[model samples]
Target: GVFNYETEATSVIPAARLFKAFILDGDNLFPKVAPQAISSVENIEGNGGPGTIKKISFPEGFPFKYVKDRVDEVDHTNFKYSYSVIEGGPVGDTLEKISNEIKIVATPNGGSILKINNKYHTKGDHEVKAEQIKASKEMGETLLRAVESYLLAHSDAYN
Candidate 1:
């Protein structure tokens, strides 16, 4: 059975701005903003669109080492993207896969809203800790905030 979860985050930045910074350039932006948590993001296969496999590495002292995720979908015009962790990280150890979909929508205040849906497939007889998921979610939020702060300081970014 797959465990389902969802989360929402709001940003003062516009949708297109947030989408471009968060999704399009995330591979480069994350490491630049939060190097301690995200060491690097490298493509292992494909060209960054659907079917692309990305390897995300972490710095020392993190619980997990790295994760290889496959891009399942990407819609630049729609500000939508989806990916699945098929190798590394907790995969094969505690999880079979972790699928995630994200959408960026415009808000009335010229800001943006992020909706994320997650599907966790645990290995047979293995269970995922709520704490584990919580840490992951917090890390995501932290990175988003870091990016937001970076964007705010550098008004020319993502323009």
Candidate 2:
């Protein structure tokens, strides 16, 4: 019902820039950040807003085929984006749905801090455990790691 996973990070890149790269331009930017996992992200419906349905595809060897999610909320000023995973074997099998909320805030030290919240709804009794949540949380951490590493390596890219 309630699960939280947050990652605090500092970057030479501005908070707005990094957040935009992930929330707004993720379809084009994520693969560049984590090519090993994400192949591409596509908007299957809507104009890339709250009602948009995005299809995120993973590499061939990944356990899941593809993930479909709906954009539940977005706030440019607040650097926040929330989405619900509606399809994909991972969610379809173990969860009824997974809603992810991400927020990034500028820190006083000329950098940024990130907060990621993953709220999962299970399908049945005793179907999900803490280990499953840890795995899912690691997935989120992995994404941030890839993005942060990419941005750090390409110093002049996100400016």
Candidate 3:
């Protein structure tokens, strides 16, 4: 079974800055600003572009320990990024895999709207719980907000 999910978020930060901090430098900035949630992120193979693989580890008490993701596509010009989870996290007997795509577009107020879509492929009869998906989405939102606050305070980052 495959499940599709979509969500959006609005931020006062510009689309370029948001994309840089969240997508380009996320592996570094995420652990810096939200140490409690993310312990570290490291590249396992390839460069930072398509086919790159990175492992993201969470804190000790987090729901899952870590997830290994492979970058599918990255477009700095259009502010679009996509990736797939190949190991760890929710990947197991219950779930086959997960793919996600995100796009950031600028608004009139210099802010940005983040559009996100996720596809969950599950194993036989097993489905991801609604509450789990909601919780993870909220966690991502919180991390994004954390990045926005960090950029706001620094004022010179991810320019």
Candidate 4:
């Protein structure tokens, strides 16, 4: 069984609105913040809501070049969203199974807390698994920082 790996961060943005921006509008948000890591995101089918299938491509790093088809399982409500990789790419080939979820919860302090969880089975050498895990954490932190910055700049624009 693959253990769940998670990273979290708190932001000044409200949970609901931040959720809409990060998960629902990730295709736009990710590239703006970490263009070096994420090259692009294309929606193959459906909207960004549940059951939507998306192809996400990453630039040079750990798993290298790969496109993962992720199906959104949950979204919007309570700022909770989940997804599973159905097919595609190098990272998929290296894993026996892969599923990732991200959640944003509203804190009483008028801020939001974001949490990312991933379950993946490693098939390569232990070093690969270690690198992947480390990269995942680093990416998550980078995303949080980006989100925080974006929100701080556009606070009044979002409801």
Candidate 5:
């Protein structure tokens, strides 16, 4: 079976800056801005930037209670970023893998287009998969709302 999902959010911040902050500075900013869903993100090792491995845990009662091991793969020049889950820390070890990609592109009017794509494979009943998809989409939308809120507040900080 095929299971995939994608979402997008536009931000007032420049493409480069938004990519840097959301993808590179994610560990620092996500928890602060969306603590209800993103409880904590910790760098496992290294300088804590691209190629860094991090662990993310959502808050209790979160739709998806899985703690995912995410490694950032950055393409700074193209303003693209990607991350994959190497291990399932909590919830369950039922998923084979889960990955996500984010791209920030400059728009004509000095705005930025942020697109996110997620792919995952799971070993579960159809009902479980359906539940997962619904929960994931909700979480994605929540993240987008938080990002938009931050951008609106920091308009002066961007181009």
Candidate 6:
């Protein structure tokens, strides 16, 4: 069976600021904030566009190995990003692929609301659970919070 869901996360950070940090400059700023969960992020092929192949490596203690994600869509003007996990831990001998789409919009509160859509393709009759994706969802929210906290503290950054 396939797993699909749409989730929302709200942040006090501005849309443009969050867009640049989370969507545009994530490769440069993410590892610096959360070194434990993410050891490094490298673009193995292409730039930040639709065909970019980026690898996300977890620490030794983490559950998964380095996985390669191919960029499906990246729209800085509209604050939308999408990618699919094609190799490593979950795919190949285990499952098919995991696809994710993120959309960020400005709220009336001067902040931004993030909407994330996740789809899991399975191999045969394998079932994909929401809890399975929850782990990564929580991790992602934590990572964003850390980056936002640092940018807030520095003020001079992303302001």
Identify the candidate with maximal TM-score. Answer: 3
- Model 5: pairs clashing at backbone N, Cα or C within 3 Å: none
Candidate 5 per-residue lDDT over residues 8-121, each given as its tens digit: 777766787777667767787789889997988887866754566777888887544556555667788998888777675423456666778888899988779878887776
What's the lDDT of the predicted structure labeled candidate 3?
0.92
Task: Please identify model 5 stretches exceeding 4 Å from their true place.
Answer: 49-51, 64-66, 89-93, 123-130, 155-159
What digit string (tens of lDDT, one per residue) describes model 2 on residues 61-156? 877878898999999899989999888857765577888888888877767777777777776632556776676666666777777677777777
- True-vs-predicted CA distance for residue 33, candidate 1, Å: 0.8
CA lDDT of each candidate?
Answer: 0.90, 0.76, 0.92, 0.73, 0.72, 0.85
| lDDT leader | 3
Candidate 1: C-alpha lDDT: 0.90
- Each prediction's RMSD to truth: 1.2, 2.5, 0.9, 2.9, 3.0, 1.4
The TM-score that candidate 2 achieves is: 0.83
Tens digits of lDDT, candidate 4, 65-114:
65555666765567778887666653445565567887898999989888
TM-score of 6: 0.93
| lDDT at position 1, candidate 5 | 31
Candidate 5 local distance difference test against the native: 0.72
Q: Higher lDDT: candidate 2 or 4?
A: 2
TM-scores for candidates 1 onward, in order: 0.95, 0.83, 0.97, 0.80, 0.78, 0.93
Q: Candidate 6 — which residues are off by over 4 angstroms?
A: none
Q: Which tens-of-lDDT digit does each residue in 30-93 have in candidate 1?
A: 9999997899999888988889998999899988899998999988888999999899877886
Worst 10 residues of 4 by lDDT: 121-130
User: What local lDDT score does residue 106 receive in model 1, on the 0 to 100 scale?
Assistant: 96
